[PDB]
Amino acid sequence: NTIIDWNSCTAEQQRQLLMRPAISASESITRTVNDILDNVKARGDEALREYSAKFDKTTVTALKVSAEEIAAASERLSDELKQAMAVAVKNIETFHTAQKLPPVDVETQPGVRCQQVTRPVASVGLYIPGGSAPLFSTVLMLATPASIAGCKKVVLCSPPPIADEILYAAQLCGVQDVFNVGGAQAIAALAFGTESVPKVDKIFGPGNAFVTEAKRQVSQRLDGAAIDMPAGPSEVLVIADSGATPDFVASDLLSQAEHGPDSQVILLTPAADMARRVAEAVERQLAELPRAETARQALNASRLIVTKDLAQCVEISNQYGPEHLIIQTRNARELVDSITSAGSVFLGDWSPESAGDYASGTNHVLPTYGYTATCSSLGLADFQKRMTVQELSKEGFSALASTIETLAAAERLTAHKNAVTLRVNALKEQA
Amino acid sequence: NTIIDWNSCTAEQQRQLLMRPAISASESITRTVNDILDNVKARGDEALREYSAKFDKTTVTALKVSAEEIAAASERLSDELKQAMAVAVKNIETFHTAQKLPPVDVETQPGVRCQQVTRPVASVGLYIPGGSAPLFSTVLMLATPASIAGCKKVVLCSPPPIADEILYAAQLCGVQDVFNVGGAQAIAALAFGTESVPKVDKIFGPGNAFVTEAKRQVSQRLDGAAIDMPAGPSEVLVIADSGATPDFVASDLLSQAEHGPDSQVILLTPAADMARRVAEAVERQLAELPRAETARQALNASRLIVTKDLAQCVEISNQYGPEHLIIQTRNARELVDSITSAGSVFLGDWSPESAGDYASGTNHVLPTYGYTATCSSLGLADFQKRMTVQELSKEGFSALASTIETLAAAERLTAHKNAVTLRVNALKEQA
Ligand SMILES: NCCc1c[nH]cn1
Ligand SMILES: NCCc1c[nH]cn1
Ligand SMILES: [Zn+2]
Ligand SMILES: [Zn+2]
Known part of the structure; x- marks a missing residue:
């Protein structure tokens, strides 16, 4: 009150x-998550199966959930729920698809054509916390934009045993692979990759302290991977x-x-x-x-x-x-x-x-x-990237040549200036 | 070869x-940069003048470059060079303006209106290395998109003495303030703010190893600021x-x-x-x-x-x-x-x-x-934020209520479910 x-x-x-x-952040977890990562990178699955004993009696067998297991899970879910999810996905799909950046194609000057195009992030890994009552809705929030962007590989990791709701959610959004792994070791598996878990370009999804730490670390390592956003x-x-x-x-x-x-x-x-x-x-x-x-x-x-x-x-x-x-x-x-x-x-x-x-x-990952x-809120943009393209015709280039030489000259970049002179001289001879 | x-x-x-x-880490440079950042946050300008005092023969006095000095540097540049920058800025402006996102406003279903609106980053700080051959063109690449995005404050830091070209390029693109500070101190100054330098939300521009490390550190600290992108x-x-x-x-x-x-x-x-x-x-x-x-x-x-x-x-x-x-x-x-x-x-x-x-x-900050x-290549989006907005009418809310309750109940989030029930009952009562 x-x-x-x-x-x-x-x-x-x-x-x-x-x-x-205030951010406490204990070194305890920083070193712990450090061991985990190094161990996962070096001894792949073997390391994972080991951790699959320490935390939660799962003693994971096959890291990848089978198609049968997903189908068995999907059958145990009520129609009410299944239909509830189709509604959510349909609306989430409509909102994110609306976020598509329309193509950028312009001539800043005649003959100088500049474009901005979009390319999807090659592969993305989705992390989903486990437990008795998991927030499976986050699956729809991560996997749907990944689908819309056209990501070639979309995979999901979650602590085993994975609830029927997550399995069905992943399947509904077209997730390709679901892996029985969680915590700081699931993040490492995604960042470094193992014999079963593929190395991805970007990791999405929040989790406990360890997961948060792991994401932070793999985001700062050259061997690791990028993440969706910091936590809080x-x-x-x-x-x-x-x-x-x-x-x-x-x-x-x-x-x-x-x-x-x-x-x-x-x-x-x-x-x-x-x-x-x-x-x-x-x-x-x-x-x-x-x-x-x-x-x-x-x-x-x-x-x-x-x-x-x-x-x-x-x-x-x-x-x-x-x-x-x-x-x-x-x-x-x-x-x-x-x-x-x-x-x-x-x-x-x-x-x-x-x-x-x-x-x-809308997306609840914010x-x-x-x-x-x-x-910004998670949206289509987080599963793709803007790539620029330019093409100068002989005319456009000739019209810009002097400007470029003047600038390159002021920055003392001789080779930059020479690339222009060589081309202008070639055109003079063909004129 | x-x-x-x-x-x-x-x-x-x-x-x-x-x-x-592979890069490295050098615990020495990390520690050095750490002490620099802390020293600048704790002791502001006084701390900045101590550094300028040891690195230069003419200790900086006024941190903010005067409007007078800016006009002088401008008079000293050739009309050729000034005209060239105008061509660049104009083309840079045309390309980035074309990146403006069209409105995202859709009704996922009757009465459920969802929008994505953009908002500029309030304040941004730009860093520019100094020296003999200054790459002043980067100023055009950073300040231009900033202006277009609508950022309320744009300031720039560069190691004194600051070349006429930088000062001119800054004025040309409407940069509000220019400060005589460089290296990890400038980044610290922009990230934390001092008596003279304003604290900004995001820092743009590459630099040497110390600048790079300083940008990495402030991006990681809570009392710091965001950065455009990692280097390499x-x-x-x-x-x-x-x-x-x-x-x-x-x-x-x-x-x-x-x-x-x-x-x-x-x-x-x-x-x-x-x-x-x-x-x-x-x-x-x-x-x-x-x-x-x-x-x-x-x-x-x-x-x-x-x-x-x-x-x-x-x-x-x-x-x-x-x-x-x-x-x-x-x-x-x-x-x-x-x-x-x-x-x-x-x-x-x-x-x-x-x-x-x-x-x-096109932008050359890539x-x-x-x-x-x-x-992605630096672009208009980097000086903005995407914000989500939604409004459901009574009709829209009423048509989506069962779905929400079902999903909420499935995640065992009772209060989430109750927030729906209360509204549904209030509507029955009403009519
Ligand atoms: N912050 C997560 C939003 C959520 C998931 N489920 C219900 N609420
Ligand atoms: N990568 C920086 C681009 C540049 C500056 N000037 C010429 N080239
Ligand atoms: Zn170059
Ligand atoms: Zn919630």
């Missing part, structure tokens, strides 16, 4: 109110005016809170009345949540802030740059233009966070922990 | 040729058939070679006679280069490979993924489609590397050292 009267706080107390958790605690910031519904606001704060004890939960409202009613609704709803220890633990760091007006809410939100920004105001749409920093925005009272997590079609400053 | 017959090499040798040299030796790969002009091929190889003793220059040709002629052309042209010790050393690691046919040329290039791909073949454009990985491609006899470096309009596998 405890409401915060923003304008009664000192300037320092304020910045302190929104400060994100998830965040949600709700802006609510006097017209908002306390229960709706609370349900979104709680949705975020139930993700992990480290979740950042923030409410901004110009009405003390609203802040108080939201705190009450949070209390009531919390009491009905089953496994609600993390939600309560996350709420210990929450902030229910009362601002002087709506503009101040936007001002605070922009400084923070939240992963998820939910605008439950009466003219939500109009505020979008003034929002300069957020991962994903949800407008109105009928756009719950959960809608974006599962079926609106930048957080302040990275909204320069990084 | 002379020439390499690809198909005469063993499978093992062929795999070694495609690999690039520069490269060029030329594919040439029997119709290519030896001297043209050679001049491009030399253009790249003169960029640094670590440059990688490669030739892939189906004709053994072409390889020999190019090798001789390279030696003859090298003899005329004023100071080509750099070019000379770089050529020691060059590779002039004779292949079976162009198909094999493309296959090898794609596995390598060169920073610059130059195609001097009869059917140049026809091959582009087959090119799956390259930073920037040049087509035909009249598209010298030099043309792209200075005036075609991914190298194999980063072409997932990284």
Whole structure:
């Protein structure tokens, strides 16, 4: 509970109110993940099978899940679920396909043709945390854009035994191979490759501390691979005016809170009345949540802030740059233009966070922990790259030659200048 | 050396040729850079003047270059040079402006509106190495896309004294502030901010080993900033058939070679006679280069490979993924489609590397050292952020509610499910 009267706080107390958790990061895990990587790179599968004893009694046999196993899993899933996933995929597919960069083809000057084309990332590996109730929805979020971009190889790793939901999810999005491996060793297998797991160009998907560390390390190693983005605690910031519904606001704060004890939960409202009613609704709803220890633990760091007006809410939100920004105001749409920093925005009272997590079609893999400053939500662009192309006709080149020689000359790049002179002389002789 | 017959090499040798040299780490430079960064964050300008004091004979006083000094440097440059930069900027501007993303606004289904909007990175800092032969053109390549993106603040740091060309290039592209600082201190200054230098969100521009390490470190620190891309030796790969002009091929190889003793220059040709002629052309042209010790050393690691046919040329290039791909073949454009990985491609006899470096309009800040596998040429997108926005109407939310609950329930995220139920019930009540 405890409401915060923003304008009664000192300037320092304020910045302190929104400060994100400090990064502990123990060397313990840095060295541990270091052993794991080196070991996986050198002794491939043999190393993997070994770790397949240490953590979780899996004693993995064949690293790759068979087509029969996937089929057996797909049969045990209800039609309701299967149909639910087809809806999500269809919408996610529609949104990402819409992100395709239209071809760039222009002549900056007559005869000087410059283009920007797209090429897909050759191969991508998808990591999915295991457990009893895995977040299989992330499979749809990673594998669908990978499919749309035209990635030649799309593979997925997850701690064995892999739940039926993940198997079916992978299959539905066309994942080629699913491997029984997890933790820091699954990341290494993807970055370095083994006798069974292929080396990929980019690794996608969040996970625990070890997985996060492993991704960080393989992203800084020449022998490793690139990653989708750095990690950080998830965040949600709700802006609510006097017209908002306390229960709706609370349900979104709680949705975020139930993700992990480290979740950042923030409410901004110009009405003390609203802040108080939201705190009450949070209390009531919390009491009905089953496994609600993390939600309560996350709420210990929450902030229910009362601002002087709506503009101040936007001002605070922009400084923070939240992963998820939910605008439950009466003219939500109009505020979008003034929002300069957020991962994903949800407008109105009928756009719950959960809608974006599962079926609106947007991607729920977003930048957080302040990275909204320069990084973007996962989209088509993260599974491809922009390649430029240029062709100068004899005319275009001749028209630019002098400019190029002058510049190359000012930078003291003789060979750069000579490449031009040689060509101009060749043309003079053929003219 | 002379020439390499690809198909005469063993499978093992062929795999070694495609690999690039390994960097290092030097705990000494990492530690040095670490102390520099911390010292700059803790003691600002005073700390910067202590460094300037030891590295130069004239300790810097005012860190910000005056508008007065900028006008003076501008008057000292020739009209020829100034006009040339204007041509470059104009073409660079035209190409990057054409990269503006069209609106992404779609209804995955009735009442479920999903958009992708862009927002500029608020502040960016550009670094430019100093010295005798300053590559001022990089200023045009960095400041131009920044201006187009709409970045609110653009500042530049360069080791004093700062050449007139840089100052002019900066003014020309609207760079707001220029600061007399270089090396790892400038990066630290931009990443942390000091009394004079503003803290920026992202840092652009390559530099020496200390700059590189400084950029790696600030990109990893939470109190740091993002960077454009990791560095590595520069490269060029030329594919040439029997119709290519030896001297043209050679001049491009030399253009790249003169960029640094670590440059990688490669030739892939189906004709053994072409390889020999190019090798001789390279030696003859090298003899005329004023100071080509750099070019000379770089050529020691060059590779002039004779292949079976162009198909094999493309296959090898794609596995390598060169920073610059130059195609001097009869059917140049026809091959582009087959090119799956390259930073920037040049087509035909009249598209010298030099043309792209200075005036075609494409960006010459490109991914190298194999980063072409997932990284793109610098472009408008690097000075922006993609933000997702969604709004479901009551109808849209109502039609998608069962799907969300089903998926939420499947992931055992009760609060996520409850956020839907509450809304559904509120709508029944209403009507
Ligand atoms: N941050 C992950 C979003 C998610 C997955 N499932 C539900 N919510
Ligand atoms: N790789 C830097 C491109 C350049 C600068 N000037 C000429 N060439
Ligand atoms: Zn969620
Ligand atoms: Zn060059």
